[PDB]
Amino acid sequence: MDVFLMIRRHKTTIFTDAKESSTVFELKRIVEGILKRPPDEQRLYKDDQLLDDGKTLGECGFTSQTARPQAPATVGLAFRADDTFEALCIEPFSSPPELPDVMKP
Amino acid sequence: AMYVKLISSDGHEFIVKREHALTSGTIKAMLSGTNEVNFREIPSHVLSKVCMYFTYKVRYTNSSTEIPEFPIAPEIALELLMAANFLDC
Amino acid sequence: MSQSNRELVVDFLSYKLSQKGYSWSQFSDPMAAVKQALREAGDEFELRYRRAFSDLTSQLHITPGTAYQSFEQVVNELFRDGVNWGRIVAFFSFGGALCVESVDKEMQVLVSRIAAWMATYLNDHLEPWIQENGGWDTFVELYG
Amino acid sequence: PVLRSVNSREPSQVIFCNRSPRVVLPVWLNFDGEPQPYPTLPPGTGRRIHSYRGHLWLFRDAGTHDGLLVNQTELFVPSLNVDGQPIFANITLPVYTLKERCLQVVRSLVKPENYRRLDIVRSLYEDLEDHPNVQKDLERLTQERIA
C-alpha cells in the first residue's frame, strides 16, 4: 500500500511516495538519490519524533488514511554537520491573504 | 524517476517527479525551452497545493478506485484558481 | 340525440380514411361545426403526440378475432383517471388509427366493427360526462 | 431527438451505487429526449431501482450540477440481467482539472451577483459564470455521434 509524503528541510520540499511496508532507511535512500547525502547523515522526523531506520513507514504512523496523494504526510529532515547534527528546521509556507468579503458566509 | 525543482516566489524549492510536473502544459513548455522552473508570482502556499494536485491526478487518472475529493480551503481557492489558469492543469 | 354521436364517429373515421386514400363508402353504408372542430383536433393531437401512435403501432398485434379485446384495453386505460376533452379526441384519434391500419393490413372487415365499438362506448361511458360539461358546443368553444 | 431512452418495456434491475462524496442526482433521459430528475442518493448510499433495457442515465451533483461518472463513463445504459443478479452503476468523482475544481469551490462560496467583485482576469468571470448543466453536456454528447 502506497503512502504519499512531503520530505521537508529548510526551504526544500520533496514530493515522493513509498510502500507502507517500506522502512525509514529505505526512505532515506530516496532522499539520498535526490539530495545527494547518504542515510547515515540524515535524521527523519515525524513531527518532533525521531524515526528509527528499522521501523516501517506504517509503524511510524504513515498510513493510507494519513499520507494521501491530495493530502500528504510531512516528514522532517535534518543533515549531519561536522561532528554534530543540525537541528530540525522547516521554514513554513507563505500565508494566504485575508478571506475577501464576497467569500464569507 | 527524474525529478524537477519548482521554485515558488518566496524561495521555496519543491522537488517533484518530472512526469508529475508535466501535468501542466506551461511547465512542460518552460522545461522544453534546465531541470528547474522559477515561478515569480506563485507563493509557496499555492505552489505546494499545485504539487499536491500533480501527485493526485497521476494516482487517480485512469484508475478504477473510488476517487476522493481534492480539497481546497477558502483562503487558498482564489489564488489556486489563478495559478491553475496560468499553468493549464 | 343518441345517434347524433354515431354521426361523429362515422364522420371522423371517413376523414382519417380519406387522408390515407380510402373511402368510407367502400366499407359500410351547428352539427357541421363540431365535426370540423373534432376533425382539426384529431389532426393536432396526431401531430403533438406522434410517439403515442408509434408506440401503439409496435405493441398491438392487431387481428380480427382479437381486435375488440385490444380496443377495449386501450380505451379503458385511456379513461382510467376519468375523462376530459383531450382524451375524448384521443379516443377518436385511436379509432381512426385503428381503422387506417386495418385497411393497411388488409383487414377491412374491422372498419365497420370499429365504428360500432366507438359509437357504443361513446353512448354508454362518455355521453354522461359530455352533457354534464355543456355538450359538444363547449368542446367547440374550448378549441376556438 | 438523438439521445433518448428506448421504449423497450424490458425490465432491468439496476443498483445505483454512489461511490463519491457528492449527493448524486440520477438523471433519466426520457423517450422524448428531455432529462428528468430522480430521487437523490446521499454519499456512500445505494438503492436497487427498476429500469429498462436501452434507457439512458446521467449522474450529477444534486446541488452544483457538477458532472459525475458512471462505470468510468458519462452515460449508463441498463442491460438484461444475467443469473438474476442486478447491474451495478458505480457513480464516482472524475479527476477534475485543478482549474475546474477551483471554479467549483469558488462557485460554492461567492454568490453569482458577486463574481465580478473578485480580483481575477475577466476570462475567469466568464469561466465562473459558465456553470455545469445537463443541457450543455447533452449537446456535446449528441455531436459526438459522428464516428
Numbering used by the authors:
A (entry chain B): 1 to 105
B (entry chain C): 16 to 48, 57 to 112
C (entry chain D): 1 to 29, 82 to 196
D (entry chain A): 61 to 207
Lines quoted from the article behind this entry:
Overexpression of BCL-xL and BCL-2 play key roles in tumorigenesis and cancer drug resistance. PROTACs are heterobifunctional molecules comprising two different ligands connected via an intervening linker. The ligands are specific for an E3 ligase and the target POI, and formation of an E3/PROTAC/POI ternary complex leads to K48-polyUb formation and proteasomal degradation of the POI which otherwise would not be targeted for ubiquitination by the E3 ligase. 753b is a VHL-based PROTAC and we were interested in elucidating the molecular basis by which 753b induces targeted degradation of BCL-xL/BCL-2 through formation of VHL/753b/BCL-xL and VHL/753b/BCL-2 ternary complexes, respectively. For our structural studies, a complex of VHL, Elongin C, and Elongin B (hereafter referred to as VCB) was used as the E3 substrate receptor subcomplex, as VHL is unstable when expressed alone.
Hence, it was surprising to observe that, the relative orientation of BCL-xL in BCL-xL753b was drastically different as compared to BCL-2 in BCL-2753b, despite being co-crystalized with the same PROTAC molecule harboring the same POI ligand i.e. ABT263 (left). Superposition of the VHL subunits from the BCL-xL753b and BCL-2753b structures reveals that BCL-xL and BCL-2 are rotated nearly 180° relative to each other along with a ~14 Å translation due to the altered path of the PROTAC. Unlike the BCL-2753b complex, BCL-xL does not interact with the VHL ligand. Moreover, the majority of PPIs and protein-753b linker interactions were mediated by electrostatic interactions of residues residing on the α3 helix of BCL-xL, centered on one end of the 753b linker. The oxygen of amide moiety of the linker (closer to ABT263 ligand) is positioned such that it makes an extensive network of hydrogen bonds with D107 (BCL-xL), R69 (VHL) and N67 (VHL). As a result, this network is further extended as D107 (BCL-xL) simultaneously contacts both R103 (BCL-xL) and N67 (VHL). R103 (BCL-xL) also acts as a bridge by contacting both D107 (BCL-xL) and D92 (VHL). Additionally, the interface appears to be stabilized by R69 (VHL), which makes multiple hydrogen bonds with carboxamide of Q111 (BCL-xL) and hydroxyl of S110 (BCL-xL). For BCL-xL, there was distinct reorientation of R103 and S110 in order to generate neo interactions with VHL and stabilize the complex. Although the loss of polyubiquitination was not significant for S110A and Q111A BCL-xL mutants (lane 3 and 4), there was a significant loss of activity for D107A (lane 6), consistent with D107 being a central residue at the ternary complex interface where it coordinates multiple interactions between BCL-xL, VHL and the linker moiety.
